[PDB]
Design a protein around this ligand. Structure first.
Ligand code: NA
Ligand code: NA
Lengths: 297, 297
C-alpha cells in the first residue's frame, strides 16, 4: 500500500507575509518526519505522533512550545492520539510544564488501562513515567505574551493523519487552546470524535478551529459518517464543516485520509496551514488556491 | 407534543436482592422529578438536570454522593449536559468537593463562552459562581471504602434523556467513574458524543458502562447516526451496543429518545436500572425483559 501523511496548523485568520515562510518550513518539517517514518515501514500512529512532536517543539505553532496563553499568562495544553486498528487511544487535558503533550497522550494509551488523563493526575502520571518537568516560561513565546495583552484589552490546534504501508490509519491532535481562556478550559483536541477520529474501516480525521463548535458537532466522527454513507473525502469535509458553520456558527478546518488513500485539507476559516506527502510528492498550502507541489525524496 | 423522560443507573453486573429495592426507589424518584418538570411545561434540559441531581444526591448511585473512589480513596466526578435546539452544552471533569457536578456543567453552559472545564479550573469556577464547597468526605460512603479495599487487594454513569412539550431534546450524564481509577482519569461521561448527545433533528442519548469503550466508539453519537439512516430506536441501540462489544470488547448500556417520541433502554452488561415516564405511565426495570408499568400522575 502507498502511505500518506497529512498535517495541519491552526484553522484561523490571515497570516502575516513573513510569518507564512516560518509556517511553510514548519509544515514541511512535520510532513517530512511523518512521511519518513511511513517510508521506512513505521506505523501510522508513530507517523502522526512524530509529525505533531515537530509542531509542538516549533514555537510558530499553537501546541507545546508556542501554545497560546490562558487568562493567567500560563500554558495549559491538550492532546489526543488514536490508532484505527483497535480504536486504542490516549488523551491528556490541561497539562503543564512538559514539552510534548502528544507523547504523554501516547503513554496514556500504552501504559494505562485508561484513555484520558487530566490536569493534576496527568502531571503525576508524567512524573511517574520519568517525563522531564520543564519551566512554564520555556513554553511561553513573546508573540503569545503580546497576543494575550492585546486580547485582554479588546486560534486552532495542530494535527496529523496517516495511512501506513499495512493499511492502518491514525490521527494526532495537540493544542495550547484559545488566547485568554479560563483556567481549566478543555477544548475539542483531547475529545475522541471531536479533536479527531481514526478507524481502519473508514479513515482518519484531525480538526482545528473553534473548539466549542467542533465539540458540539463531533466534527471528526461526523466527517467519517459522510464517508460511510458513500461521499468522497472532499464532499464529507465540506458537508461536516458546512454543517458546523450553519448549525453552531463555527469556523475551522480538518484533514482526512480514507482507508483507500484519498485525502483532503479543507477549511471555513480564512486560512489553514497544511501539507500532505504521498508517492514522493509534497503538497503544501495556507490560503485557498495557493497549493504548491514539490518532490519529497 | 407528549413529553417523555428516560433515566438510567449504572450499566453493570447483577444487583443484590435488598439493594434492588433502593435502586428501584431511586429510579422512580429521578423519573418522577424529570416527568414533573416536563408536565408543568418545563424544558428538556431542566428535566434531565432535575432527574440527574436526584441520582447524584442518592448514595445508591455512582454520581455525586455515592461516587466510586479513585486510587487515593477520593471522589473525582465528571458530568455533561446538552441542549438539542442549538447544541449548547456544558461539561466538567475531575471535579471534587461539590454536591452536584451536573449543576456545575449547567453553569459552564450558561455562564461561560466554553463547554468543558476540568479539575482546578472547574473548582475555581464553582467558587466564583458561589457553589458551596462540601467536605469531599460528605460524598464518600462506607460501601465505596470497602469496594476500594476489595479491588486493591484482588461501574457506570447515571443519566437522563428527555423530549419536552415544545419538541426539544436533552441529555445529562454524571459519574464517579470506575473503582480504584488513576488520579485525573476522565471517562466518557463529560465527552459530547460519548457520554451523551442531544439534537432536536434526531433525538437524545445518555450512556453507561465501560467509559474507555464508550469513548472509543463514540457510543451516543453512533446510536443517533443509525436513527438518521432510518433505523428504529431499538435497532440503533442494538447495532451501537453490538458494535462496542465486537470492536473494543466493551459492555454497557444506553437510553434513547427520538424527536418523534420513540424511546428505549438497552444494555449488554448484566443489568441497567432504568425508568421511563410518558402519557401518565411509569416504566421500570433492571434485568432484561423484566419491566413493570404503573400510573404516574
Ligand atoms: Na509549538
Ligand atoms: Na449518588
Amino acid at each position: 500500500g502507498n502511505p500518506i501523511v497529512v498535517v495541519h496548523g491552526g484553522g484561523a485568520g490571515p497570516i502575516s507575509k513573513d510569518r507564512k515562510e516560518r509556517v511553510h518550513q514548519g509544515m514541511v518539517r512535520a510532513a517530512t518526519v511523518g512521511y519518513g517514518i511511513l517510508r521506512e515501514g513505521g506505523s501510522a500512529v508513530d507517523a502522526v505522533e512524530g509529525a505533531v512532536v515537530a509542531l509542538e517543539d516549533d514555537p510558530e505553532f499553537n501546541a507545546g512550545c508556542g501554545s497560546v496563553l490562558n487568562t493567567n499568562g500560563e500554558v495549559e495544553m491538550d492532546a489526543s492520539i488514536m490508532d484505527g486498528k483497535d480504536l486504542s487511544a490516549g488523551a491528556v487535558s490541561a497539562v503543564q510544564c512538559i514539552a510534548n503533550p502528544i507523547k504523554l497522550a501516547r503513554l496514556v494509551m500504552e501504559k494505562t488501562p485508561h484513555c484520558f488523563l487530566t490536569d493534576q493526575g496527568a502531571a503525576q502520571f508524567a512524573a511517574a513515567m520519568g517525563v522531564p518537568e520543564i519551566p512554564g516560561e520555556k513554553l511561553v513565546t513573546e508573540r503569545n505574551k503580546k497576543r494575550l495583552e492585546k486580547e485582554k484589552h479588546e486560534l486552532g490546534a495542530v494535527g496529523a493523519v496517516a495511512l501506513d504501508c499495512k493499511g492502518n490509519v491514525a490521527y494526532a491532535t495537540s493544542t495550547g487552546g484559545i488566547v485568554n481562556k479560563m483556567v481549566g478550559r478543555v477544548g475539542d483536541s483531547p475529545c475522541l470524535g471531536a479533536g479527531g477520529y481514526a478507524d481502519n474501516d473508514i479513515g482518519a480525521v484531525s480538526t482545528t478551529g473553534h473548539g466549542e463548535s467542533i465539540l458540539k458537532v463531533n466534527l471528526a466522527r461526523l466527517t467519517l459518517f459522510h464517508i460511510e454513507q458513500g461521499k468522497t473525502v472532499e464532499e464529507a469535509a465540506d458537508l461536516s464543516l458546512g454543517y458546523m458553520k450553519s448549525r453552531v456558527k463555527g469556523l475551522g478546518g480538518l484533514i482526512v485520509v480514507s482507508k483507500t488513500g484519498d485525502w483532503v485539507a479543507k477549511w471555513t476559516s480564512t486560512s489553514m496551514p497544511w501539507a500532505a506527502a504521498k508517492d514522493g510528492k509534497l503538497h503544501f498550502g495556507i490560503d485557498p488556491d495557493d497549493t504548491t507541489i514539490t518532490d519529497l525524496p
